[PDB]
Structures are given as structure tokens and as C-alpha cells.
Amino acid sequence: GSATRELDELMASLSD
Amino acid sequence: SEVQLVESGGGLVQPGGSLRLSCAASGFNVSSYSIHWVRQAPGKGLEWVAYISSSSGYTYYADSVKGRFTISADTSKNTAYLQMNSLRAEDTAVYYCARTWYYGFDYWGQGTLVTVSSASTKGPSVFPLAPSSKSTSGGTAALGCLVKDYFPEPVTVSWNSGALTSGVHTFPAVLQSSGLYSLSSVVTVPSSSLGTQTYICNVNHKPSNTKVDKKVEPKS
Amino acid sequence: MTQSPSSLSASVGDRVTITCRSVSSAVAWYQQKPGKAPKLLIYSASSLYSGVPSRFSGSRSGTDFTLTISSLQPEDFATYYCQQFKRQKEPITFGQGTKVEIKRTVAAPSVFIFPPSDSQLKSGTASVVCLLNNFYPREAKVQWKVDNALQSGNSQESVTEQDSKDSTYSLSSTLTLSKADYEKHKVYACEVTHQGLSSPVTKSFNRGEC
Numbered sequence: 003g004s005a006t007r008e009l010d011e012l013m014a015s016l017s018d
Numbered sequence: 019s020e021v022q023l024v025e026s027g028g029g030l031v032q033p034g035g036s037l038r039l040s041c042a043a044s045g046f047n048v049s050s051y052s053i054h055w056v057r058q059a060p061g062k063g064l065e066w067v068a069y070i071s072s073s074s075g076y077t078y079y080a081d082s083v084k085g086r087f088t089i090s091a092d093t094s095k096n097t098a099y100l101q102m103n104s105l106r107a108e109d110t111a112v113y114y115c116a117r118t119w120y121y122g123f124d125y126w127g128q129g130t131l132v133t134v135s136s137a138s139t140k141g142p143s144v145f146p147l148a149p150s151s152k153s154t155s156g157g158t159a160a161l162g163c164l165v166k167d168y169f170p171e172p173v174t175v176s177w178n179s180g181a182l183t184s185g186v187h188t189f190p191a192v193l194q195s196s197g198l199y200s201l202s203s204v205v206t207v208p209s210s211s212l213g214t215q216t217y218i219c220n221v222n223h224k225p226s227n228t229k230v231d232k233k234v235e236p237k238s
Numbered sequence: 239m240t241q242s243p244s245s246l247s248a249s250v251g252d253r254v255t256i257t258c259r260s261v262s263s264a265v266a267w268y269q270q271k272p273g274k275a276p277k278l279l280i281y282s283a284s285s286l287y288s289g290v291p292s293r294f295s296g297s298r299s300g301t302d303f304t305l306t307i308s309s310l311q312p313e314d315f316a317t318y319y320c321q322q323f324k325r326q327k328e329p330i331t332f333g334q335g336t337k338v339e340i341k342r343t344v345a346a347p348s349v350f351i352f353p354p355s356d357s358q359l360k361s362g363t364a365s366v367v368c369l370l371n372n373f374y375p376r377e378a379k380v381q382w383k384v385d386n387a388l389q390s391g392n393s394q395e396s397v398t399e400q401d402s403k404d405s406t407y408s409l410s411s412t413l414t415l416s417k418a419d420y421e422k423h424k425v426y427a428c429e430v431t432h433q434g435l436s437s438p439v440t441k442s443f444n445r446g447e448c
């Protein structure tokens with residue numbers, strides 16, 4: 003839930 | 019234990035071939051936590067290789083596997099998968115799946131060994147490592163067995179059917195240039211016992227359904 | 239890329255601080271023991287994972303992330319890994335492993351040499367094995383001689399994990415020759431050099447006597 007959010011947002015934000 | 023990750027689908031494959039690993043999750047929903055695959059070559063470090071959010075569908079791969087591996091999930095079976103195509107020798111490793119926990123991976127599966135080789139499954143030849151006859155009455159002697167030319171890992175070695183355990187060293191296998199493995203198992207015993215006690219190594223190679231007992235006796 | 243773990247010797251009770259070797263947003267720390275899955279110690283730089291002992295702590299200073307074990311116990315000797323998270327490729331990377339091993343008093347190896355079996359010789363190959371038993375520290379030099387010619391490139395070594403009871407290592411070196419080559423020579427010797435030996439120890443046999 004909130005446990006997965008930070009890493010998921012990190013991964014989704016990647017551009018290179 | 020309440021959360022668990024159970025892997026399967028590993029084992030043997032040839033360069034250029036394909037395997038599919040599974041990661042069955044229990045105690046949590048795959049749509050609530052992202053999942054990763056991580057691998058480790060024998061004697062080497064951990065290498066992160068892929069990531070999936072099951073809810074969003076977002077996937078990411080390490081460049082070392084990009085274009086060759088596909089990560090996916092079936093939320094109805096609560097299982098993640100790693101499809102591995104165009105496999106190479108260097109993909110040989112223990113593959114783990116693991117769950118996201120803030121900045122960290124909390125739960126890890128047990129690992130499944132993937133061996134990418136052109137070798138076919140073959141039982142070991144077992145040879146005695148005979149104790150030095152120049153020991154002799156005292157004090158400490160060594161003896162062993164050489165377990166040679168087998169594929170794949172692992173082999174187990176016991177001594178005197180498990181009755182002898184003190185002083186036993188079974189070494190990590192080395193991969194020979196033939197693509198076959200080889201290891202030694204040794205044990206130290208009193209030198210006085212060399213004439214009075216039989217020593218037998220019991221070598222089991224489960225992948226080939228081979229089991230060899232070898233009597234190891236002095237020179238003399 | 240990737241590679242073997244580096245080594246750190248420490249005594250029970252010692253304090254250890256490992257530094258995680260492109261700046262990272264967060265770091266996680268793991269402990270792993272042979273044949274086991276990694277175990278999470280610290281997540282998000284400084285949070286102790288549920289059930290991990292309080293002697294384990296994590297900290298950030300500037301761009302440097304550390305894990306500290308305040309006082310080592312036997313069960314803490316293992317390989318440690320930092321995991322970097324960053325907003326750039328590769329986004330998740332495990333650092334090189336750091337294998338914390340037990341510092342023990344120096345102990346010289348017992349050395350034994352083994353000729354090839356007659357049964358192996360039937361198959362056209364001779365394997366000669368030299369055993370270094372229960373020594374510390376791990377670092378040892380094994381040099382093969384055949385009729386006093388120093389060998390290189392025809393042997394392979396293997397070393398055990400540090401023994402759980404006495405904290406020593408053991409090592410096998412296997413010299414492999416063809417039957418033909420084995421039979422062209424007399425004296426087979428294994429010379430061992432180690433911190434616990436004041437001068438090198440040689441074990442040998444002569445073909446046809448043993």
C-alpha cells in the first residue's frame with residue numbers, strides 16, 4: 003500500500 | 019511465517035534456449051506490492067534484473083537482460099513470472115523473487131538454480147584419495163574421494179553412511195573446461211585407525227539417479 | 239559486474255561500520271549466509287526492519303550511507319550488501335558484497351598429498367590432490383612441482399566456508415595431467431606457504447611407490 007508507493011513512484015518517474 | 023514467495027521453473031537449459039520462472043505469492047496481494055527478480059551467480063554478488071507493478075503494469079529491466087527477459091504477473095493466480103529467452107552461460111545463477119518494502123525488499127523466495135550449459139546430465143566417476151601409508155601408527159591421517167566429471171550440481175557426499183561426520187570437508191565444486199563439475203571430499207582420522215576401520219564415501223548425484231559408494235583404503 | 243565479495247576480518251565483540259560504495263536517494267542493507275536468501279536489515283537508509291536486533295543501525299551523512307553493527311556476535315558473520323535506489327538508470331543496484339569473517343588465532347595447515355587412483359589412470363587422466371586442512375587465515379599459497387619443475391596453469395583450487403566450530407578454512411588443489419604425462423615423471427610435490435609456517439612445507443610422493 004503505502005509500503006510500495008515510494009519505489010513505485012521512483013520507477014515510474016525514470017527517463018534514462 | 020505468514021507472507022511467502024515460492025519459486026519454481028528453474029533447472030537446466032542450453033545457450034540460446036528459454037525458461038520460465040514462477041513466483042507464487044501468499045499472505046499478500048501482488049496488486050498491492052511490486053515484485054522484483056534478483057539473481058546471483060555462484061560465488062558472486064546479488065544482481066537486480068527486473069521489476070513489475072502488477073496494478074499499474076509498469077515493468078523495468080536491467081540492461082544485462084533487457085530485450086531477452088520478460089517480467090509479467092497473473093493477479094488471479096497471485097503469481098509473478100520471468101520469461102527468459104536467448105539464454106547464455108553467464109545467466110547461470112540462483113534466481114530470487116522479492117517484494118517491495120519502502121526502499122527495500124522485505125520478503126524473498128527460496129531461490130531456484132538456473133544452469134545454462136551445453137552439457138548433458140551425467141553421473142560422477144568416484145575415485146579414492148588413499149591415505150598415506152607413511153602415516154603411520156600416529157598421529158593424524160587424511161583420506162577422501164574425488165567426485166569427477168558430473169553435470170549439473172549438486173552432489174552430496176557422506177562418510178560411512180553418515181556415521182562419520184567429524185573432520186569431514188566436502189569442497190565446493192569447480193567447473194572444468196569440459197563443462198563438467200568436479201569436487202573432493204576429505205576426512206581426517208587417527209592414523210592408528212587406518213588398519214582397523216573401513217572408510218567408505220557415499221556419493222549421491224540425484225539429477226542422474228546415480229549413487230556410488232567407494233571404499234577408501236591405504237596404499238599400502 | 240557483478241563480482242566476488244570483498245573480505246573484512248573482525249573479532250567477536252568488534253564494532254563494524256560498512257559504507258555503501260551518481261548519488262542515491264535511499265539505501266537498503268542485507269545480510270546473507272551461504273545457501274540462504276538475503277535477509278533485509280535496514281530499509282530507507284535508517285529504518286530497522288521488524289525483528290532485526292538493535293545492534294544493527296543505518297545512517298546517512300551527505301551522500302554516504304553506512305550500516306553499523308555495534309558489537310559483533312557469531313551469528314553476524316556473513317556477507318553484507320547495500321542496495322542503492324536512484325532516479326536514473328540503473329535505478330536499483332546491489333553493491334559488491336562485504337564478507338565479514340571471524341578473526342581467529344593463526345593456525346598452520348596440516349598438509350596431505352594424494353596420488354591418482356589406478357582406476358582413474360585406466361580412463362586416461364591423472365588427478366593429483368593436495369589438501370590443506372584447518373588453517374587460518376584463509377590466504378595460503380600452493381605450488382606444484384613435478385620432477386622439480388614448477389607448474390602453472392594445470393591446477394584448480396577450492397576453499398571451504400569458515401568452519402562453524404573452529405573458524406578455520408580448508409583448501410584442495412587438484413593438479414590434472416594426462417596418463418601419458420603422469421607416467422613421464424617421478425616426483426609429485428605440493429609446496430605450501432602460509433602465515434603459520436616459518437618456512438614452506440612440502441608433501442610429496444614418488445610414482446610407483448604410492
